[PDB]
Design a binder for this molecule. Sequence first.
Ligand SMILES: C=C(/C=C\C[C@@H](O)[C@@H](O)[C@H](O)C/C=C/C=C\[C@@H](O)C[C@@H]1O[C@H](C[C@@H](O)[C@H](O)C[C@H]2O[C@H]([C@H](O)[C@H](O)CC[C@H](O)/C=C/[C@H](C)[C@@H](O)C[C@]3(O)O[C@H](C[C@@H](O)CCCCCCC[C@@]45C[C@@H](C)C[C@@](C)(O4)[C@@H](C[C@@H](C)CCCCC[C@@H](O)[C@H](O)[C@H](O)[C@@H](O)[C@H](O)[C@H]4O[C@H](C[C@H](O)[C@H](O)/C(C)=C/[C@H](O)C[C@@H](C)[C@H](O)C(=O)N/C=C/C(=O)NCCCO)[C@H](O)[C@@H](O)[C@@H]4O)O5)[C@H](O)[C@@H](O)[C@H]3O)C[C@@H](O)[C@@H]2O)[C@@H](O)[C@H](O)[C@H]1O)CC[C@H](O)[C@@H](O)[C@H](O)[C@H](C)C[C@H]1O[C@H](/C=C\[C@@H](O)[C@H](O)C[C@@H]2C[C@@H]3C[C@H](O2)[C@@H](CC[C@H]2O[C@H](CN)C[C@H]2O)O3)[C@@H](O)[C@H](O)[C@H]1O
Ligand SMILES: CCCCCCCC/C=C\CCCCCCCC(=O)OC[C@H](COP(=O)(O)OCC[N+](C)(C)C)OC(=O)CCCCCCC/C=C\CCCCCCCC
Ligand SMILES: CCCCCCCC/C=C\CCCCCCCC(=O)OC[C@H](COP(=O)(O)OCC[N+](C)(C)C)OC(=O)CCCCCCC/C=C\CCCCCCCC
Ligand SMILES: CCCCCCCC/C=C\CCCCCCCC(=O)OC[C@H](COP(=O)(O)OCC[N+](C)(C)C)OC(=O)CCCCCCC/C=C\CCCCCCCC
Ligand SMILES: CCCCCCCC/C=C\CCCCCCCC(=O)OC[C@H](COP(=O)(O)OCC[N+](C)(C)C)OC(=O)CCCCCCC/C=C\CCCCCCCC
Ligand SMILES: CCCCCCCC/C=C\CCCCCCCC(=O)OC[C@H](COP(=O)(O)OCC[N+](C)(C)C)OC(=O)CCCCCCC/C=C\CCCCCCCC
Ligand SMILES: CCCCCCCC/C=C\CCCCCCCC(=O)OC[C@H](COP(=O)(O)OCC[N+](C)(C)C)OC(=O)CCCCCCC/C=C\CCCCCCCC
Ligand SMILES: CC(C)CCC[C@@H](C)[C@H]1CC[C@H]2[C@@H]3CC=C4C[C@@H](O)CC[C@]4(C)[C@H]3CC[C@]12C
Ligand SMILES: CC(C)CCC[C@@H](C)[C@H]1CC[C@H]2[C@@H]3CC=C4C[C@@H](O)CC[C@]4(C)[C@H]3CC[C@]12C
Ligand SMILES: CC(C)CCC[C@@H](C)[C@H]1CC[C@H]2[C@@H]3CC=C4C[C@@H](O)CC[C@]4(C)[C@H]3CC[C@]12C
Ligand SMILES: CC(C)CCC[C@@H](C)[C@H]1CC[C@H]2[C@@H]3CC=C4C[C@@H](O)CC[C@]4(C)[C@H]3CC[C@]12C
Ligand code: NA
Ligand code: NA
Lengths: 49, 294, 294, 244, 40, 40, 49
Amino acid sequence: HFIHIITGVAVFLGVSFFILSLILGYSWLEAVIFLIGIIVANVPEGLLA
Amino acid sequence: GWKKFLWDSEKKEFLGRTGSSWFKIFLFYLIFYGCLAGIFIGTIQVLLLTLSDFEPKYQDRVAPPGLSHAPYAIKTEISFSISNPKSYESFVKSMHKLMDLYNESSQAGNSPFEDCSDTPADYIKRGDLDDSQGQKKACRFSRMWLKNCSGLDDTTYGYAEGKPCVVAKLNRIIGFYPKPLKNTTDLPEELQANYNQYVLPLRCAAKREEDREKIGSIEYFGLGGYAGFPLQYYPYYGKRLQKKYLQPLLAIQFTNLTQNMELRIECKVYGENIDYSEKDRFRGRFEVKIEVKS
Amino acid sequence: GWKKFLWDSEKKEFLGRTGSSWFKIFLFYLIFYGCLAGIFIGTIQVLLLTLSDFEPKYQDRVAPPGLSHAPYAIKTEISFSISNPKSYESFVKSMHKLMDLYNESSQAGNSPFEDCSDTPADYIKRGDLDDSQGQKKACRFSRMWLKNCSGLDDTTYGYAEGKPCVVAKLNRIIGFYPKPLKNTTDLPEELQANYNQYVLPLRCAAKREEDREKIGSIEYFGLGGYAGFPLQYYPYYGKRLQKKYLQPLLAIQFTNLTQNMELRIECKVYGENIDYSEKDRFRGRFEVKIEVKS
Amino acid sequence: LTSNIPEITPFLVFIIGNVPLPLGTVTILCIDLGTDMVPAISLAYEQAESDIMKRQPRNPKTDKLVNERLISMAYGQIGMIQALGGFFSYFVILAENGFLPMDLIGKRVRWDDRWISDVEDSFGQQWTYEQRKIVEFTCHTSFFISIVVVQWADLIICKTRRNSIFQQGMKNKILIFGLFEETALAAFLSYCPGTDVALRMYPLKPSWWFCAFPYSLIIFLYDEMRRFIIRRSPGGWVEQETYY
Amino acid sequence: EGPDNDERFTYDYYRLRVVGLIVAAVLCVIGIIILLAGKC
Amino acid sequence: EGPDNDERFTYDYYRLRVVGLIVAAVLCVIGIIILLAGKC
Amino acid sequence: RQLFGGFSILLWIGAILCFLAYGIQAATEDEPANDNLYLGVVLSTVVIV
Ligand SMILES: C=C(/C=C\C[C@@H](O)[C@@H](O)[C@H](O)C/C=C/C=C\[C@@H](O)C[C@@H]1O[C@H](C[C@@H](O)[C@H](O)C[C@H]2O[C@H]([C@H](O)[C@H](O)CC[C@H](O)/C=C/[C@H](C)[C@@H](O)C[C@]3(O)O[C@H](C[C@@H](O)CCCCCCC[C@@]45C[C@@H](C)C[C@@](C)(O4)[C@@H](C[C@@H](C)CCCCC[C@@H](O)[C@H](O)[C@H](O)[C@@H](O)[C@H](O)[C@H]4O[C@H](C[C@H](O)[C@H](O)/C(C)=C/[C@H](O)C[C@@H](C)[C@H](O)C(=O)N/C=C/C(=O)NCCCO)[C@H](O)[C@@H](O)[C@@H]4O)O5)[C@H](O)[C@@H](O)[C@H]3O)C[C@@H](O)[C@@H]2O)[C@@H](O)[C@H](O)[C@H]1O)CC[C@H](O)[C@@H](O)[C@H](O)[C@H](C)C[C@H]1O[C@H](/C=C\[C@@H](O)[C@H](O)C[C@@H]2C[C@@H]3C[C@H](O2)[C@@H](CC[C@H]2O[C@H](CN)C[C@H]2O)O3)[C@@H](O)[C@H](O)[C@H]1O
Ligand SMILES: CCCCCCCC/C=C\CCCCCCCC(=O)OC[C@H](COP(=O)(O)OCC[N+](C)(C)C)OC(=O)CCCCCCC/C=C\CCCCCCCC
Ligand SMILES: CCCCCCCC/C=C\CCCCCCCC(=O)OC[C@H](COP(=O)(O)OCC[N+](C)(C)C)OC(=O)CCCCCCC/C=C\CCCCCCCC
Ligand SMILES: CCCCCCCC/C=C\CCCCCCCC(=O)OC[C@H](COP(=O)(O)OCC[N+](C)(C)C)OC(=O)CCCCCCC/C=C\CCCCCCCC
Ligand SMILES: CCCCCCCC/C=C\CCCCCCCC(=O)OC[C@H](COP(=O)(O)OCC[N+](C)(C)C)OC(=O)CCCCCCC/C=C\CCCCCCCC
Ligand SMILES: CCCCCCCC/C=C\CCCCCCCC(=O)OC[C@H](COP(=O)(O)OCC[N+](C)(C)C)OC(=O)CCCCCCC/C=C\CCCCCCCC
Ligand SMILES: CCCCCCCC/C=C\CCCCCCCC(=O)OC[C@H](COP(=O)(O)OCC[N+](C)(C)C)OC(=O)CCCCCCC/C=C\CCCCCCCC
Ligand SMILES: CC(C)CCC[C@@H](C)[C@H]1CC[C@H]2[C@@H]3CC=C4C[C@@H](O)CC[C@]4(C)[C@H]3CC[C@]12C
Ligand SMILES: CC(C)CCC[C@@H](C)[C@H]1CC[C@H]2[C@@H]3CC=C4C[C@@H](O)CC[C@]4(C)[C@H]3CC[C@]12C
Ligand SMILES: CC(C)CCC[C@@H](C)[C@H]1CC[C@H]2[C@@H]3CC=C4C[C@@H](O)CC[C@]4(C)[C@H]3CC[C@]12C
Ligand SMILES: CC(C)CCC[C@@H](C)[C@H]1CC[C@H]2[C@@H]3CC=C4C[C@@H](O)CC[C@]4(C)[C@H]3CC[C@]12C
Ligand code: NA
Ligand code: NA
């Protein structure tokens, strides 16, 4: 359940960091690269094990 | 020199500098002493936190308990004339101050005083050292129990006709259980008779072998008529958990006292967790010098 | 759920609590992050104190010095067509940006520029690394010294007719004294002729043995006509102590360059405190790919 | 959950503030595998605090494992401190090598360009591409060590939640093993002759190891007091807010 | 401080690596000793 | 904590004095060693 | 399920990409660098462990 909530928070922030990047002038590709990296860095790993 | 060093009007200096300097030094010292005060207050607050409110962290210094007395005698001497009334006033004022706390009016109602056995009994445990069951309850101690030294009949308590009393008291200690000596073949001479296990015995005597004859009849008054302290008034739970608590008392009348002569009387309590000290003359025992000069 | 968790009107709660709680938590976090910020700022100020304003505490990473060049070529390749003018614009803009700092108008007056030997000379020490004798003085470097690559006659600098120039420059290092190789029997082939001790030699060649033939006449322009850097412009005292300081430059014209073919040219400086690195291709030497396709 | 903050803050300042990258890929992998595997396992083996049987049972409806308080202590309070601890070692390494803090805002665009061999520092020197990349990597290694140093404190404070460590004691052997082993991993990777070529870690000078020490002591002292207030005042503000 | 001020550009990384390795080995040994004391 | 709670009123001053003396002797020895190292 | 689950998959990609980065290098550029080869050799070892 927790993992689920965090995933929601992470996906949101990803789209947000995206708008901050394009309003600052990056490349359409750099924004998706950032979205992918941020969502991967916000979800915890190992809890169930 | 004299004037120039005090106040010159060209460089606008007082004691040696102008003004801006005085402002900077004063401001620095104010801020510095403020940081110092704040740090000291914080390090003292952490200490006020560490300790508990119902129990001193260390109880090795006040153990075993002492033995204090009223009246308040300076140098442990009670000297007074049977004729001049202004001779034993300082004593009666003290005796009265002590007995004034056992007035029945104070021990009124169900709370927080409860009735206890009129005869010596065993210990009573009112729980642990917590705040769970609120303020504990202490046993009542009536004034009248002391028969001829109560200030109710003869306010003076005896000093009026050459027969003084001495109200002995055991020092209050938190969680201290008094343990009297057992009936085994090894026991002092005096203690053999009236071996009420529930009573801590107190017995006075003469310091020197000669004074024995010059000392008369030591008449002890107490709970149940015994010369001791009833074990039911223990243990003591501390001020915070047992406000309005009364400790037992023992009256001692030194009847038939030789006139115009200094008598050294040593009183001593007996018990297992009771130990005397050659340095502290008030640990377990006490000394009194009486001289009823008339 | 949906509504009750967002806003209920009986307990007056938002997201789960009333208000006082939000005020206490917000106040705590504000004070906490304030203490954190203050401590970080203080620990960073002590660091800004520790260091000196005229000299980096560690000079082991920038040593020995590198060798940079203008123009600004990406991937170390200079490819341009002799017909299309919009092909070598990015190069000329850079070359011009570099040479635009040696304008005579900037080097005007007695201060802070002083005249130095028109022929290579030895070192010049303007004192220690202090603020005692104010801003030091640096030697002037005229544009005209570079003969055919100066942007004063042929603004393009050569790219217009298949004859490009390359202005090489030695990386500025504080207190670095260049030391050229001595006349002993051990010295490269090239360096033998014109052994002006006061000049640090720079010589370009071909990376591969084959390309040798395809490369024409390398014509070096510099101070005194030599292919090097005069030792008189050293050492460098740093920005703070020597603002308005100009470093020597060396022009290289690659005349007679084969058309429509990639040529790999490696330039290299020689000296005692000069060492190359197989990992850093800009330490002491540099590589350029030229292809004048027309 | 605490180490998440120091690994994400560098990628944030790097993109927003435009400064040189404080933490890389190899160093991050070193953090996850070093300070989060063995110390975490050691925690399982912990003993029971005296209090275990002197406390009321739990109501599953009202008390959960992951509630809004755990994220408050890990992310909010402890995390931000480990992040500041690593940022200090970074700023120190750069300032000493010639690059100061004021001049660092905006140098990224120019820093990450392999072609500008002329990069100029604060003291006016001119740096090539690998000469400046070496200092950046020395910052990655220092960040790593500052993380292990702050982890020391985080681990010590994790042993107990109501009692102090002076009360609980240091009788856990696996936890000690973890402290010594991690320190060894950092020293080994930073000083070994060849990690430069393969892993990209560079030797650390002695005055740098100590940059993270003040931030490591602050965490320990804070948790100790945080607990004293709990023991003395039940059902207070601290227990309502930070007791996880 | 004179032309021959080459020391200002040199660092003894060798000694540093030697000491760092000695320390690493010592700390690791201490760890093994504590982890295995008693064979359990 | 029961009638036989005599431990709450006892302190092992003997062990404390022994340790304090061992430490005092050690510190003093260290001092002499440092002060006289070399015979000057 | 262990070596090829859900979070390790991204690392498997990092390794792939880096190897391609070394191939285009050695095939094209004379005297290349090796940060990519060692990066792949390190990432693969992480997924395996
Ligand atoms: C593995 C991953 C994947 C990749 C990994 C990668 O890294 C590596 O593997 C590399 O790949 C290695 C692979 C190598 C492969 C091969 C190589 O080996 C071999 C060699 O490679 C070399 C290349 C290599 O050298 C390269 O350099 C590598 C790098 O690549 C990336 C580069 O940067 C970049 O790509 C360079 C490439 C090139 O530039 C590409 C350009 C674009 C493709 C394209 O534009 C070009 C071009 O146009 O494309 C055309 C094709 C078209 O069909 C495409 C269609 C376009 C669609 C347009 C729609 C756009 C869009 C989209 C909408 C959704 C939204 C929307 C808004 O925008 C909307 C709006 C519309 C309306 C826009 C319409 C625009 C129209 C545009 C189009 O029409 C076209 O452009 C057009 O058609 C064109 O043709 C035309 O020319 C147009 O030109 C112009 C267009 C403009 O340009 C353009 O539009 C622009 C500017 C838009 C701007 O945004 C506009 C703005 C200004 C803005 O509008 C603006 O004004 N704002 C103004 C604001 C303002 O005033 N404000 C004032 C304020 C007042 O108040 C013009 O304008 C137009 O008009 C015109 O039409 O629609 C076509 O082809 C051509 O045209 C082509 O030219 C970057 C990297 O990928 C890589 O490094 C080669 O050169 C070489 O030859 C080869 O041999 C995952 C990544 C990891 O997950 C992540 O970690 C990641 O690694 C990090 C993030 C990296 C970062 O950090 C690194 C350091 C460390 C990191 O690693 C750390 O790890 C970070 C981590 C991350 C996280 C967090 C934390 O930190 C850590 C924590 C983790 C911890 O926690 C864990 C717990 N779980 C545990 C622990 O792990 O993890 C750094 O090193 C990195 O650098 C850094 O990034
Ligand atoms: C090279 C690397 C070296 C690293 C050195 C790290 C040094 C440590 C850093 C800071 C230490 C100070 C932290 C003090 C925080 C308050 C702790 C506190 O309040 O604990 C309260 C406890 C009382 O618990 P209780 O009565 O409820 O237990 C009841 C047990 N039952 C239930 C069985 C009866 O007290 C106790 O345990 C008694 C424990 C007393 C410990 C005193 C330590 C302070 C002495 C010096 C501190 C340093 C000052 C500045 C140093 C700068 C150094 C350069
Ligand atoms: C320069 C300034 C730097 C400042 C940086 C701050 C760093 C972190 C700050 C503090 C962390 C260290 C604090 C150490 C705490 C020691 C506490 C202690 O001493 O509590 C005494 C205990 C209690 O005993 P008891 O019988 O009453 O317990 C009865 C237990 N009941 C009741 C369950 C039976 O005694 C025992 O635990 C038994 C004896 C255990 C002795 C442990 C010694 C090892 C301690 C740390 C190891 C070093 C790790 C670092 C590795 C890197 C090195 C290169
Ligand atoms: C617990 C997990 C947490 C951390 C896990 C990390 C996972 C990483 C896994 C593998 C990484 C492999 C790294 C390989 C080591 C280097 C190999 C290599 O590619 O080297 C290349 C270099 C050549 O460089 P160059 O010619 O360009 O230098 C020119 C120098 N100029 C020009 C200045 C003179 O070789 C040399 O320098 C020669 C030096 C050779 C170095 C020997 C060191 C041995 C390496 C590992 C053994 C240690 C295992 C630990 C055992 C513990 C027992 C208790
Ligand atoms: C490099 C530096 C290394 C060392 C840094 C040390 C930093 C740590 C220092 C302090 C830790 C801060 C902990 C923050 C917690 C404070 C929270 C607080 O405000 O909690 C107050 C509680 C009140 O609880 P309640 O139930 O009545 O609330 C009822 C509330 N209602 C009415 C709404 C229901 O407790 C009270 O008021 C009474 C208890 C007050 C406790 C004060 C403790 C001060 C201890 C140490 C600070 C001094 C350090 C000096 C060092 C100088 C350094 C230069
Ligand atoms: C269960 C526990 C058992 C523990 C038993 C331990 C027994 C003791 C064994 C070793 C103790 C320390 C040995 C000291 C020798 C280290 C070698 C060394 O000082 O090398 C330094 C030079 C590196 O060159 P440079 O600095 O001039 O480069 C230029 C530097 N720049 C680029 C910054 C300018 O080396 C070279 O050139 C040539 C390098 C040749 C290969 C050296 C091998 C080093 C790799 C591993 C050995 C250390 C194992 C430690 C085990 C710890 C357990 C975790
Ligand atoms: C150049 C440097 C050379 C250094 C070489 C040193 C060689 C080692 C020599 C001594 C090492 C330590 C010896 C340990 C024995 C100490 C004796 C001891 O632990 O005694 C304790 C008892 C005290 O009684 P209690 O605690 O029950 O009282 C009741 C306590 N209350 C009142 C609080 C309830 O002792 C008693 O009863 C009987 C006491 C009998 C006499 C003990 C003599 C102690 C005085 C001096 C000896 C220490 C010299 C240290 C030199 C340091 C150099 C500055
Ligand atoms: C210059 C700096 C380091 C000085 C910091 C001083 C700190 C430690 C001092 C300043 C004011 C102090 C507070 C003043 C008043 C109270 C109320 C009391 O009921 C509990 C302690 C408490 C909360 C004090 C704690 C310590 C305190 C916060
Ligand atoms: C909560 C406590 C411990 C935080 C204390 C923060 C202290 C260290 C901070 C607060 C404000 C800071 C000062 C703010 C401004 C300046 C001016 C600058 O030109 C020199 C540093 C100086 C003088 C700072 C020194 C550090 C300082 C005094
Ligand atoms: C936390 C407590 C109990 C122990 C703290 C240990 C600290 C002080 C130890 C752990 C590892 C140690 C470092 C290990 C290796 C080196 C390299 C050497 O060339 C200089 C000293 C230096 C940099 C050591 C300094 C001291 C050090 C940082
Ligand atoms: C200043 C630095 C370098 C060294 C500091 C040394 C301090 C920590 C040393 C000096 C003398 C030491 C004390 C000497 C004697 C005793 C008596 C013993 O029964 C308990 C420990 C105790 C109380 C020691 C504690 C540690 C102590 C206070
Ligand atoms: Na992880
Ligand atoms: Na983590």
